[PDB]
Design a protein around this ligand. Structure first.
Ligand SMILES: O=c1[nH]c(=O)c2ncn([C@@H]3O[C@H](CO)[C@@H](O)[C@H]3O)c2[nH]1
Length: 244
């Protein structure tokens, strides 16, 4: 398992949590020095448990699919909660079985669906460590509207930070003051599957992307990613979604 305590959290302890989270995701090989997530894992081993604690020490446990860093659901006190999608019902077979009742949220984990349920897009929801404090508090007691926004914060401050060093650094900047994600943050979240695909394909194409990827850079400017010498590949992306 991995844990993160917001009580006494600083940029250093958040960075240690994101390091713990990346290290709990298995890999057999690296492609261009980036861990390649497994095509599949059978049984309960597919799901990593993250123990998150708000400033007041109240906690949820979050289930993460280790093949794709997708959050499936979470445990709050004696109630489990899962997204309304087949991958999450499958996860409910292995995690939080001991919960008194299992609620299926009235949405899938898709960003588009969560934003409709929350009533705001990601671009207008402040993220940071205070926002994660608020998200954990929201999730402790069922409220499906409130939970959709809390889940957008949770996804970005855990899974997306694991996937991209730049997003980890953006949340560190927001240790004590929330701020809507940067344009590069949204760009990277949107592009992880594409980048993962082009980096795997670049093996057999001399490190050249078969299809270049349009991103927004750290200064808010367009950058076209054509090959593995790009700083997005050499410094930023930390995990690859297996092309399978
Ligand atoms: O639960 C989630 N964890 C994630 O890391 C994550 N990243 C993206 N999503 C969104 O969920 C959809 C899959 O059902 C994707 O299309 C993303 O929008 C995520 N959902």
């Amino acid at each position: 398992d991995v844990s993160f305590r917001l009580s006494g959290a600083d940029p250093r302890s958040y960075g240690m949590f994101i390091k713990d989270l990346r290290n709990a995701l298995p890999f057999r090989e690296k492609v261009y020095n980036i861990p390649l997530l497994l095509p599949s894992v059978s049984g309960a081993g597919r799901y990593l448990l993250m123990h998150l604690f708000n400033y007041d020490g109240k906690t949820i446990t979050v289930a993460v699919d280790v093949t794709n860093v997708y959050i499936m659901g979470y445990l709050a006190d004696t109630t489990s909660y899962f997204f309304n999608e087949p991958a999450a019902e499958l996860a409910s077979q292995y995690v939080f079985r001991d919960a008194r009742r299992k609620i299926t949220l009235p949405y899938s984990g898709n960003y588009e669906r969560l934003q409709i349920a929350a009533g705001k897009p990601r671009e207008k929801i402040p993220i940071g460590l205070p926002a994660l404090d608020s998200a954990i508090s929201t999730l402790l007691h069922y409220d499906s509207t409130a939970a959709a926004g809390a889940l957008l914060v949770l996804i970005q401050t855990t899974a997306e930070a694991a996937r991209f060093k730049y997003i980890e650094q953006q949340i560190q900047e927001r240790a004590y003051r929330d701020e809507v994600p940067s344009l590069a943050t949204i760009s990277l979240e949107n592009s992880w599957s594409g980048l993962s695909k082009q980096i795997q394909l670049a093996q057999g194409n001399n490190g050249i992307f078969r299809t270049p990827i349009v991103l927004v850079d750290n200064k808010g400017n367009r950058v076209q990613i054509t090959n593995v010498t790009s700083k997005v590949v050499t410094s930023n992306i930390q995990l690859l979604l297996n092309t399978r």
